[PDB]
Each structure stands twice: as structure tokens, then as C-alpha cells.
Design a protein around this ligand. Structure first.
Ligand SMILES: Nc1nc2c(ncn2[C@H]2C[C@H](O)[C@@H](COP(=O)(O)OP(=O)(O)OP(=O)(O)O)O2)c(=O)[nH]1
Ligand SMILES: [Ca+2]
Ligand SMILES: [Ca+2]
Ligand SMILES: [Ca+2]
Ligand SMILES: [Ca+2]
Ligand SMILES: [Ca+2]
Length: 901
DNA sequence: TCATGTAAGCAGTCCGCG
DNA sequence: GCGGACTGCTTAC
């Protein structure tokens, strides 16, 4: 097999590399890598190295990496550019793996671990590590085993061995319900003392050294705790055995309002799953406890136990250990679904970076572009300092707040990457500038043509047309990858809808789910077999189709994120290729493209309708337009349609056969106007929206920019079994809105769009009457909590104290004296409830850690004093009033003359 | 919240507005 | 009471 790296590090003048050799074995080597850097050289002299602008360079070979680093410093002292890859390990990887890396995941040791630490005096701080580690569960992907290290004797209690037999049993048998599929994979090791446990753990670690190390909060908690606890008991040298090269560093992670410490383990790639989840999931959650995320992702119930976690080991060690094991498994289950580890490996090996660098689009693109240029013996420029400067972004149209009955939307494919490719925007393709007219002059096609030679953006920039820049070339590669996975995702989505339809008429039989590939549209034969299947088999197929869709989503959306990240990186001062001219060329071209096509669509539809100056485009944001289809429907007449699906088909055909060709003609003209390199402005129909045929539903509404709701029947070619609400920006979509309130507002919207005013009024009246019965957590607001200390003046709110911070200060007074009480953590999320006048907490609100029950000390008082009236007005009535006023609808029945009967 | 960008919405504080 | 200046937070893209 072809070799591939696992990890790479620079330690002084050595590269330390862990890798898989040609025989599939893991090896480690120390290489005295001699790096090269570059300086500009006279034009008259012969060389094969040129910078990105075609200026000749001489290569400088250094005796060692420290000499190279020192040379860069002296070049700064002199005032001359020191060119080349200054991150020598990237250069090492580029030299050692000068081909497209083919990796075998089965040879990569991925470790998932979690520790337990009993602490009687509050949260066990990793930097102090003053309490015994009393459990570690460490899953190894190569062995496919859960290694359980269990401390039986502690200063906080002596316990009996954990029983695998009890662990396996149902909760209803007094067991822990450790999933049957992992029972045979547990290797259980009890220990008489903590020193023995840790020494054995380190020996185990040496034998099975993680390449990828993951788990939940492992970077911020488990790793620093283990490192510091071992350091405290045995000394530094023993703790450094967590690094295969015996090198570690305390790394200070700084943010806007403070800093924290993590432990860098040289020769390991730490991908904390909480961080993978935050980057790759495209969710914003009210809580990031593993319980919460597991329930959200997997529909598993929270791990239930009596009493505080600080007493769980002594009261129920059996459950304590079982829950440690289950916690490790839940992360594996989330990854089986989301496939973020797979994604990280794909991206990392593609870029030729340390796998943990996938968190940085700047590092990722630096490596991709470096490798690409190196292939042509080209030399990358030195990174430079730049002041942070604001620059303009997208255009968003101000919508007229209203109901909108029939709507068809259209969207540009991968806009910013397409602009980069179309215009040929790259550091080395800048050709010059032209005299800019106001943007509206380009939009209306009255400005002078910018150039007859170069490819242009309306910010004034011109680009070469003779050859693609490295940015367009490399962005295209990832774009094409993204397109493939999006194809699989959408096929899985369409396949899911076939199954949903079939589930209306399930067969009374005993059968099995069909063995199919959900990434491809079901054949006619498969469709016929589906129509004969039982509900059990159909539901299993639906689950599998949906899992295939999620895998496709992960692969596609994050490749999209990577390419959009390149467009953003051009506007980040730390990017080697930072250039506000290029960053702004992209965004300004986007503004023109949207407004140009708004004009063209309005012109086209006014022609087919025989009107003048009518606005068909009701809204647009960045790359999408929303077109009122009322007049199109009315031209044939609603009574001509057999059912909802009939007019959806009609609009689908109208969009594809009439509007898209007109849109394409419009963009081809714009391409010619800007003299662009290649026409890549591809705007296709996105959504078809409207009320059910014959209903009193309003179809859709807008309240303002980035705030709307549509009842959608077809989305990018997926024809839904049941209409789907597309709601953007409204409170139903915000993590800050209480859970039960999101649900209620969504039903209000559903009724508005599908059923009408009377249905909405019926529901509102019921919710208002019953909502006080809702669980307090379900009606709590949510907020991130920053700068708690800043607004804390002697335990009370300082000037301009935010509402949620005031709530935290209230909580802090209520629990004062308790070392045991859950503390609110700076930067994390809290639940927030308003409090009635004259409550014993002495303020108008209270807040506590999100994803948790409020401590029993004050729970009863919170429940008694919760201000339901304020809660309802703020979270429910105010947003609903906004939706209904926009839609010209009443949520309460107005008096009429009939009331006199 | 260490980790690519800008546009723009709403909650809430402070306080003017005769 | 509501709107502007401002902070804080959160989405849409
Ligand atoms: N710099 C930067 N731009 C972004 C980011 N997210 C969205 N944008 C900009 C660039 C996108 O091309 C543009 C439109 O985004 P969309 O979500 O509508 O999707 P896009 O057209 O990129 O892809 P798609 O429609 O799914 O093919 O908005 C981002 O994270 N960074
Ligand atoms: Ca735990
Ligand atoms: Ca798009
Ligand atoms: Ca599309
Ligand atoms: Ca059937
Ligand atoms: Ca869009």
C-alpha cells in the first residue's frame, strides 16, 4: 500500500513523524529535515523557482530548521521578503507525500475516552487535579474494545467491583441498560489504588497510543485533568508519557474576555468531539451537555440517577461505572451518525495538514495552495501584518411586510466560490483597476463597460483571463467534491419521501428491509417492492435513508463551508493571501448579480403578464430571490387544478422551462458586460410554496429582512409527502426562545400558512389557557452568559447589566455558601426565568446552567414565583403579534355585528 | 467563546421627549 | 411609551 502520515511535529531541529508504512504497520521516525526558503534574485540569472507574480527566486537550503527560522528574522531586520513555507512540518509533509494521499482509516488508532473524578468541594479543576481519578473508559477503534479502569479504593470511599451482568440488565430489573451490542466488547480492570490504575493506564497508552484522540470536553477537561493528576502524583516526566515523543506544552487559549489552559500532546491529534460538533453540525444548541446532545441526535433518554454526581460513586458505584461506559459509547453513536471524524480525516489528508488543523480554514487553505503552487515550482509569498479594516458584504432587499400566497424562489449555486471562478479572483491574477461608477449604474447596465481586455468586478478590480489563478483552480476542486456529496444527500432525501408515501399504505406481512444504496434514486423495481412492504420494514428503511441523508449532509455542507471559508479568508488579516481588494471584489460582484437578476426577472415577468413596473421579486438575500407567483396561478385559474400537486407541477414546469432560461440569458449578458472568464452564475429554482388548494391558508409571510415563513411543497426537486414549513429568522428558529414556545409559535405559523385565521385563533386561545402547566425548563429562555464579573458589583447588578446576567447574579446570591451547588460557568449558556414582584430572590429574574434542573435548594421557590404573565407576553405574544400584523391577520377574534345574536 | 467573512434582526438598558 | 444610542446575543447568508 501507499504510505501515509498519522501525525507530524517539529521538535527543535527534528521532525517527529508517526506514519503507516507500505506494509500497513505503524512506525515512528525522527528526521533531521533540512528546510528550504527563498529570496528574490536578479532577473538575468537562471533559476527554476518563481514567485506567484513570475519574479525569479533563489532557493536557500538550511543546515537545520532553527537556521531557517533565524534567517527569516534577519530578513525582517534587513527589510526583505523571506519567501516559502515557514511552517516546516507542512513542507516536510509536502516533500514526503508528493502525491494524492490514499489513507486507510482501519489502520488509524482513534481513541474515545472519558474520566470520572469524585469531588466533594465543587467542580474538580483540571489545573489543580486535587481529587483521585476513579474511572476511565477508553475505547480503541483498532481493537474495537472499551477498556474500563475502575478505582475500588479511594479517600472518598471503598466500593465493590462493577458487575457486567447487572450492567446488561434492563432498568426495570435494577440494571443499567448498557447496550447489548457493546457488552462483549468491554474489558474490565479493577484497581486497589489510584497509583496502580494510572501506571497501568500509561502502559496501556504506550501499547495503544492514540493517533486521533476524542471524547466530550476532552481538550478542556479529561486531558488536562489526567496530565495534571499524573504530574501531581508521579512528576512531570511520567505525565509526559501521554506524548509518544515525551513532549508537552501548556497552551494558553485566549479570547475576548479571558484565557484558559490546555495541554498540547506532541504526536497526538486531539479532536474534541464537542468542538467537532460545534464546527460541523450547523446547529446552535441551548446546552452542550452530552446528555442533551445525545437526546437531540439519537433520541436516547438522559442517564438517570438519584442525588448529586459527587455522591454517585459511593451510593451507586455500579451505575457510576455503567454511565461512564455509556458516555463513551454515546459519542461513538453520534459519530456513526454525523461522521465528523471521517470528515476530518478526509479534509486533513486532502490538505496535507495535521488533522487537528481542520478547525482552521486559514491553515487548511494555506496548505492546499502551497502544495498546488509547489507542483509548478512556484514560491509562496511571506505572510505580512495588516490592520483590521471593515469591508462591505451582501445585499439584502427590504421586503414589504405582508402575506404572500404563492412564492417560487431561485438561488445561485455556491455563489462566492462561483464568483471567484467566474471573475478569476486570485492574488496573482490582479491585472489593475478601472474607474468605478455607482453600483446601480452597473445593475441597470448604463455604466461604461469596465474592460475590453480583463475580467471585472464592479468594485473596480480587473483580472487576467489567460490562465486560472491558483485560488480559482483549488476552489474548483473542492467545489466539485461538494457537488458529488450533495447529489447523494438529495437522492437520499428523495428516497425518504418515497418511503414516507408508501407508509400511508403498509402491508400486513412479516418481511425485511430492502438491501439498497440510498445515495441513488430508487429504481422502478425497488419502488414496486417498497409498495408491498410492512410498516416495520418501511420504518427501518426510512431510518436508513435518513442516516444516508445525514452522512451526505455532513460531507457536502462542510465542503461548502471550506470553500466559503476561502472567500472569507481573503478578508482575514492572518491569511497569507489577505487582500481587501479581492475580498471586496467577491462581495460587490454578489451585490450586483442579485440586483441585476432581480431587474431581469421583473422585466421578464412583466412581459409575460403584459404589465409595466410591477414588482414580482418580493425579496432577496445575498444569492437568492423570492418571486410572487400569484399572477401566474391566476392566469390559468385555481379552479382548473385537480389538487395541490397539480399547481406545484405547473409552477415547477414554468420555473424550469420559462424562468430559468430567461435567468440564464440575463446572467450570460452580465458575464459579457463584466468581460468575465467563464459564465458560472447558475440560478435554479429552489422552493415552490403556497397554501393547500381550497384551504384558507395564507401560504407565506415576511415581517422584515431575514424573517419569513413559507409552506413548501417542493425544495430543490424533492417533492414532499407532506408540506414542510421553511421558517427563517423567526423565534421558532432561535435557540434563545423557550422550547415549548418554539413549538407553539411553529403551530401558530403552520395554522396561518395552511389553514387560515380562524384556525390560528382557535389554537392561540387554547395555548393561552393551558401554558401555565408547561414544565419550567420548557418555558425558560436561553442565553450565552459572558462578562458575568464585569456587571457584578458586590453580588448585585452594575450599570447596564444585561437581563440574563442579572438573573445569574440573583442565582449566585440564592446559592451563596454552597460549595456543592452547580456554578454558572463564564461563557456557557443559562436558562432564564422572570420572577414576580415581591419574590424572596429580591430581583426580577433568575438564571441557572442550561441543560440542567435548577438545584433543589431553590427549585420550589422558583416554581412558586415564576412570572408566567411576563414569560407569555415576551416570548409568545410579542413575536406572534409581529407575525400576525405582518400577515394582516388577527390572533384574537374581533367583535362583529353577529355577536348580537 | 481558538478556529473564514458581512448584514441585520430583537431584547434589554439608559434616558430623552416639553 | 417609544425611539435612538448602545451592548449583547443570535441568526441568514
Ligand atoms: N465568507 C463567507 N461567506 C459566506 C459564509 N456563509 C455564507 N456565505 C456567503 C457565501 C455564499 O456563497 C453566499 C450564499 O450562501 P448560501 O447559504 O445561500 O449557499 P451557497 O450559494 O454558497 O451554496 P449552495 O446554494 O448550497 O450551493 O453567502 C461564510 O461562512 N463565510
Ligand atoms: Ca461523568
Ligand atoms: Ca445559493
Ligand atoms: Ca440550488
Ligand atoms: Ca403497501
Ligand atoms: Ca441562499
Amino acid at each position: 500500500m501507499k504510505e501515509f502520515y498519522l501525525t507530524v511535529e517539529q521538535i527543535g531541529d527534528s521532525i517527529f513523524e508517526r506514519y503507516i508504512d507500505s506494509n500497513g504497520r505503524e512506525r515512528t521516525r525522527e528526521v533531521e529535515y533540512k528546510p528550504s526558503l527563498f529570496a528574490h534574485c536578479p532577473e538575468s540569472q537562471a533559476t527554476k523557482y518563481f514567485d506567484i507574480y513570475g519574479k525569479p527566486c533563489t532557493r536557500k537550503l538550511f543546515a537545520n530548521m532553527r537556521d531557517a527560522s533565524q534567517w527569516i528574522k534577519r530578513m525582517e531586520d534587513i527589510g526583505l521578503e523571506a519567501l516559502g513555507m515557514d511552517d516546516f512540518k507542512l513542507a516536510y509533509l509536502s516533500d514526503t507525500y508528493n502525491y494524492e494521499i490514499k489513507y486507510d482509516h482501519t489502520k488509524i488508532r482513534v481513541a474515545n475516552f472519558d474520566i470520572e473524578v469524585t469531588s466533594p468541594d465543587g467542580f474538580p479543576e483540571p489545573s489543580q487535579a486535587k481529587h483521585p481519578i476513579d474511572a476511565i473508559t477508553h475505547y480503541d477503534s483498532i481493537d474495537d474494545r472499551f477498556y474500563v479502569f475502575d478505582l475500588l479504593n479511594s479517600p472518598y470511599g471503598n466500593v465493590e467491583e462493577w458487575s457486567i451482568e447487572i450492567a446488561a440488565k434492563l432498568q426495570e430489573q435494577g440494571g443499567d441498560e448498557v447496550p447489548s451490542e457493546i457488552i462483549d466488547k468491554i474489558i474490565y480492570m479493577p484497581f486497589d489504588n489510584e497509583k496502580e490504575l494510572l501506571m497501568e493506564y500509561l502502559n496501556f497508552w504506550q501499547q495503544k497510543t492514540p493517533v486521533i484522540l476524542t471524547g466530550w470536553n476532552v481538550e478542556s477537561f479529561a486531558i488536562p485533568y489526567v496530565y495534571n493528576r499524573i504530574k501531581n502524583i508521579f512528576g512531570e516526566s511520567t505525565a509526559k508519557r501521554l506524548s509518544p515523543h515525551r513532549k508537552t506544552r501548556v497552551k494558553v487559549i485566549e479570547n475576548m474576555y479571558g484565557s484558559r489552559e490546555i495541554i498540547t500532546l506532541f504526536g497526538i491529534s486531539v479532536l474534541d468531539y464537542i468542538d467537532l460538533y460545534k464546527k460541523f453540525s450547523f446547529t446552535n444548541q441551548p446546552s452542550y451537555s452530552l446528555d442533551y446532545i445525545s437526546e437531540f441526535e439519537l433520541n436516547v433518554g438522559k442517564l438517570k440517577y438519584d442525588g448529586p454526581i459527587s455522591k454517585l460513586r459511593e451510593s451507586n458505584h455500579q451505575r457510576y461505572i455503567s454511565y461512564n461506559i455509556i458516555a463513551v459509547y454515546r459519542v461513538l453513536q453520534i459519530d456513526a451518525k454525523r461522521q465528523f471524524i471521517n470528515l476530518s480525516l478526509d479534509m486533513g489528508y486532502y490538505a496535507k495538514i495535521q488533522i487537528q488543523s481542520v478547525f482552521s480554514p486559514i491553515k487548511t487553505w494555506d496548505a492546499i495552495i502551497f502544495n498546488s503552487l509547489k507542483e509548478q515550482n512556484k514560491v509562496i509569498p511571506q505572510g505580512r501584518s495588516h490592520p483590521v479594516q471593515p469591508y462591505p458584504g451582501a445585499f439584502v432587499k427590504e421586503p414589504i411586510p405582508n402575506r404572500y400566497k404563492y412564492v417560487m424562489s431561485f438561488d445561485l449555486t455556491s455563489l462566492y466560490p462561483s464568483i471567484i471562478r467566474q471573475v478569476n479572483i486570485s492574488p496573482e491574477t490582479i491585472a489593475g483597476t478601472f474607474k468605478v461608477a455607482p453600483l446601480h449604474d452597473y445593475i441597470n447596465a448604463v455604466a461604461e463597460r469596465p474592460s475590453d481586455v480583463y475580467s471585472c468586478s464592479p468594485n473596480g478590480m480587473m483580472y487576467y483571463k489567460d490562465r486560472d489563478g491558483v485560488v480559482p483552480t483549488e476552489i474548483t476542486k473542492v467545489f466539485n467534491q461538494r457537488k458529488e456529496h450533495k447529489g447523494y444527500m438529495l437522492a437520499a432525501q428523495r428516497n425518504g419521501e418515497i418511503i414516507k408515501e408508501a407508509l400511508h399504505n403498509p402491508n400486513l406481512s412479516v418481511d425485511e428491509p430492502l438491501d439498497v444504496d440510498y445515495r441513488f434514486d430508487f429504481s422502478d423495481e425497488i419502488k414496486e417492492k417498497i409498495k408491498k412492504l410492512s410498516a416495520k420494514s418501511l420504518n427501518e428503511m426510512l431510518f436508513r435513508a435518513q442516516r444516508t441523508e445525514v452522512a451526505g449532509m455532513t460531507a457536502q455542507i462542510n465542503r461548502k463551508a471550506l470553500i466559503n471559508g476561502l472567500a472569507g479568508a481573503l478578508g482575514n488579516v492572518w491569511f497569507r493571501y489577505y487582500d481587501l481588494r479581492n475580498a471586496t471584489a467577491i462581495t460587490t460582484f454578489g451585490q450586483m448579480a442579485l440586483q441585476w437578476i432581480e431587474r431581469k426577472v421583473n422585466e421578464y415577468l412583466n412581459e409575460v403578464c403584459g404589465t409595466e413596473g410591477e414588482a414580482f421579486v418580493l425579496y432577496g438575500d445575498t444569492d437568492s430571490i423570492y418571486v410572487s407567483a400569484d399572477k401566474i396561478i391566476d392566469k390559468v385559474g385555481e379552479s382548473k387544478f385537480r389538487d395541490t400537486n397539480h399547481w406545484v407541477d405547473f409552477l415547477d414546469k414554468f420555473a424550469r422551462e420559462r424562468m430559468e432560461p430567461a435567468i440564464d440569458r440575463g446572467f450570460r449578458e452580465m458575464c459579457e458586460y463584466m468581460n468575465n472568464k467563464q459564465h458560472l452564475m447558475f440560478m435554479d429554482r429552489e422552493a415552490i410554496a403556497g397554501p393547500p388548494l381550497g384551504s384558507k391558508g395564507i401560504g407565506g409571510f415576511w415581517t422584515g429582512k431575514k424573517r419569513y415563513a413559507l409552506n413548501v411543497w417542493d425544495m430543490e426537486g424533492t417533492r414532499y409527502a407532506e408540506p414542510k414549513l421553511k421558517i427563517m429568522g423567526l423565534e421558532t428558529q432561535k435557540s434563545s426562545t423557550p422550547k415549548a414556545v418554539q413549538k407553539a409559535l411553529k403551530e401558530c405559523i403552520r395554522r396561518m400558512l395552511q389553514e387560515g385565521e380562524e384556525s390560528l385563533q382557535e389554537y392561540f386561545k387554547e395555548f393561552e389557557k393551558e401554558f401555565r402547566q408547561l414544565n419550567y425548563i420548557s418555558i425558560a429562555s436561553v442565553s450565552s452568559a459572558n462578562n458575568i464579573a464585569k456587571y457584578d458589583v458586590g453580588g448585585f447588578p452594575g450599570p447596564k447589566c444585561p437581563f440574563h446576567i442579572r438573573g445569574i447574579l440573583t442565582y449566585n446570591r440564592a446559592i451563596k455558601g454552597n460549595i456543592d451547588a452547580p456554578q454558572v460557568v463564564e461563557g456557557e449558556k443559562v436558562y432564564v426565568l422572570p420572577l414576580r414582584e415581591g419574590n424572596p430572590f429580591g430581583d426580577k429574574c433568575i438564571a441557572w446552567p442550561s441543560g440542567t434542573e435548577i438545584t433543589d435548594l431553590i427549585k420550589d421557590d422558583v416554581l412558586h414565583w415564576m412570572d408566567y404573565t411576563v414569560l407569555l407576553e415576551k416570548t409568545f405574544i410579542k413575536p406572534l403579534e409581529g407575525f400576525t400584523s405582518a400577515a394582516k391577520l388577527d390572533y384574537e377574534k374581533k367583535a362583529s355585528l353577529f355577536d348580537m345574536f
